[PDB]
């Protein structure tokens, strides 16, 4: 459940994890 | 294994021994390790390992002098990491000092007695004359212990600049700048250079070459001591720092902008220096607003670098004895932290913030594990936040602020919710 973070596209962020 | 000896014309900087010289040497040395890694020609390093810079300058009165003791000491007309021969390898002062003139494993003296005879016997009594005179110019660097170096003078028939630099003790621009800096430092009494070098250092990336940029900037940076692209930006930071240690909030705002606009390598360097720069120029009551604000700001690409700065500032407060701010600024800010939008990211910022604020050993030490898991929210990421919050809720915070803590958590519980199972 990974996405791109809004303030830096190279950082991943997590929704289902 | 080896490259040619160097003996620079410049002597050690006196200013570096002071209180504001030692702390400059630590911060400008961090920037130097990184300018060396980014733009050194690496001619004496075969292996990839980034931080293995050395210069071939032997101690004399022997063993090689460390690069961290040779700050601004290498000759400005040499491009960084170039180890090849140039017309100024060894200074006139080192041949006077090492051989007591004051006006290895091999018999190099006999090789130097030879050729002084044989060349004189061809050029005193034009192709050979030019190549033999070249040979004398080069081999004069191994002449020791003699009146017979004045055989060079008696053997009579860039231009003069590699020569004027001895008499005063792109290739044209390099030695012409080196002449200018050496005059201003040693012969001040017998301002346009300082202007026109700033013009050269503010042309385009193409109109001023990289090797011309780095040498002229290191020239001006030496003139400031003694009280007399990511790499182009990193060099410009060195000039800013030497000025700061020899309006203060403007001079820090440019560093936070350097982190927000910089490549990750460039930003990681600035985030290593920023803790000590803050401590050297600001009281921690004024620091604390900016460093939390730039960990939280939406124009922040690098939370994981900022998470190491707000650990130095909190651990400094937690060890200098001003332990009030490592509760008071936590309680002030925890509304902003809990209300940031992306949940795993906001929870992870708080896990850093409380780790950084902690009392004990171990919870101060766990930060690299927290920085490792940036953006995650598995069972171990929520459980660590519960534990780390329970450290703060026990050993820091009085019931009125302990109710303020409960109220801000309730305002987001509607991973925050399971704190209410262990805060009670």
């Amino acid at each position: 459940x990974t996405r791109h973070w809004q303030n830096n596209w190279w950082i991943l962020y997590h929704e289902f994890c | 294994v080896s490259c040619l000896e160097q003996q620079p014309r410049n002597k050690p900087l006196k200013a570096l021994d002071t209180r504001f010289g030692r702390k400059l040497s630590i911060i400008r040395g961090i920037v130097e390790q990184e300018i060396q890694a980014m733009v050194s020609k690496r001619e004496n390093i075969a292996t990839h390992h980034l931080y293995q810079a050395w210069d071939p300058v032997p101690s004399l009165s022997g063993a090689l002098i460390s690069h961290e003791k040779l700050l601004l000491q290498i000759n400005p007309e040499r491009e960084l990491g170039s180890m090849s021969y140039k017309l100024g390898q060894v200074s006139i002062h080192s041949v006077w000092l090492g051989n007591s003139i004051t006006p290895a494993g091999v018999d190099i003296h006999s090789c130097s007695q030879f050729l002084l005879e044989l060349y004189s016997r061809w050029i005193l009594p034009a192709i050979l004359i030019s190549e033999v005179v070249r040979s004398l110019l080069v081999v004069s660097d191994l002449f020791t212990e003699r009146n017979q170096f004045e055989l060079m003078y008696v053997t009579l028939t860039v231009g003069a600049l590699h020569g004027i630099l001895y008499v005063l003790e792109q290739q044209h621009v390099l030695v012409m700048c080196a002449t200018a800096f050496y005059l201003i430092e040693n012969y001040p009494l017998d301002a346009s250079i300082i202007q026109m070098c700033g013009v050269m250092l503010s042309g385009s990336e193409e109109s001023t070459p990289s090797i011309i940029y780095h040498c002229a900037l290191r020239g001006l940076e030496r003139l400031l001591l003694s009280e007399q692209s990511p790499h182009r930006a990193m060099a410009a930071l060195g000039l800013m720092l030497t000025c700061m240690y020899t309006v203060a909030m403007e001079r820090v705002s440019v560093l936070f902008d350097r982190i927000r606009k910089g490549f990750p390598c460039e930003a990681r360097v600035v985030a290593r220096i920023l803790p000590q720069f803050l401590d050297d120029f600001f009281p921690p009551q004024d620091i604390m607003n900016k460093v939390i604000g730039e960990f939280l700001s939406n124009q922040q690409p690098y939370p994981q670098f900022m998470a190491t700065v707000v650990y130095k500032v909190f651990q400094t407060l937690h060890s200098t004895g001003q332990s009030s701010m490592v509760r008071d600024w936590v309680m002030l800010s925890l509304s902003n932290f809990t209300q940031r939008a992306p949940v795993a990211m906001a929870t992870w910022s708080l896990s850093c913030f409380f780790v950084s604020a902690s009392t004990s050993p171990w919870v101060a030490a766990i930060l690299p594990h927290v920085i490792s898991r940036m953006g995650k929210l598995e069972q171990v990421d929520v459980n660590l936040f519960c534990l780390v919050a329970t450290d703060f809720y026990r050993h820091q915070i009085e019931e009125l602020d302990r109710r303020a803590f409960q109220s801000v958590l309730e305002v987001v519980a509607a991973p925050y919710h399971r704190l209410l199972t262990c805060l009670r």
Binding site: W9 | E34, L87, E205, P209, P264, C265, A267, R268
Partner: protein, 250 residues
């Protein structure tokens, strides 16, 4: 007359043969570049002479000779500047020659470890090759299509190496990196690239976001036969920076 440019270039070839004899053939430690100062002066004069004769394509040939000599003599950061001078002198009259000269500038920047300079030059190449070589008068013509494939692979590896923040991350970079994902389109997305190389570059751009280090190791040996040596160096730098970052000092 114009024969002065022939005299100056034949003189420069003599000085460059003297510098190649000393620095490459004999490898003399006693060399200090006096023949190269003479070569750069005679080619400088012949460049200015060709420009006052209105022959910028002839001036660019002399810029390429000096740039090649500087690169061969171990000065890649200097050679990149004269390759870009050559490209600028050629561009209004010979767009494909300018792309050849920019390609040598980018190779020289990679030798000089100037990765952000290389990223900018390849982006300029990919823009010019679409402008001058990718029209109906749409798919690229064969010579320009080979430049486009070089730039795309190299830019993707440089962007994975450098990872620019917002506003340094140009529309041209965001748009390239968008292609190296998948979501909703199977029942041809490879563009100019061979399909095998495209699926491995897709996989690499995904494995680097996930920090999936064992996938990057696997992809690096699978891509080794498909890449140029310069591109295998770039892919090594991406794997190296992933396992042990720069700027940490320790």
């Amino acid at each position: 007359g114009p024969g002065e440019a022939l005299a100056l270039t034949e003189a420069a070839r003599l000085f460059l043969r003297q510098e190649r004899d000393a620095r490459q053939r004999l490898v003399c430690p006693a060399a200090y570049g006096e023949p190269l100062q003479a070569a750069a002066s005679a080619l400088g004069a012949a460049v200015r002479l060709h420009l006052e004769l209105g022959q910028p394509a002839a001036a660019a040939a002399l810029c390429l000779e000096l740039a090649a000599a500087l690169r061969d003599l171990g000065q890649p950061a200097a050679a990149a500047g004269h390759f870009q001078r050559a490209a600028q002198l050629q561009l209004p009259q010979l767009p494909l020659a300018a792309l050849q000269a920019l390609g040598e500038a980018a190779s020289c920047q990679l030798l000089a470890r100037d990765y952000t300079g290389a990223l900018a030059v390849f982006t300029r190449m990919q823009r010019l090759a679409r402008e001058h070589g990718s029209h109906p008068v749409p798919a690229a013509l064969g010579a320009f299509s080979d430049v486009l494939v070089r730039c795309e692979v190299s830019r993707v590896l440089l962007l994975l190496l450098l990872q620019p923040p917002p506003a340094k991350l140009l529309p041209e970079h965001a748009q390239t990196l968008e292609k190296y994902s998948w979501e909703a389109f199977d029942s041809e997305s490879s563009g100019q690239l061979p399909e095998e190389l495209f699926l491995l570059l897709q996989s690499l751009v995904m494995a680097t976001h996930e920090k999936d280090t064992e996938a990057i190791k696997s992809l690096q040996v699978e891509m080794w036969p498909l890449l140029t040596a310069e591109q295998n160096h770039l892919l090594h730098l991406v794997l190296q920076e992933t396992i042990s970052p720069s700027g940490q000092g320790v």
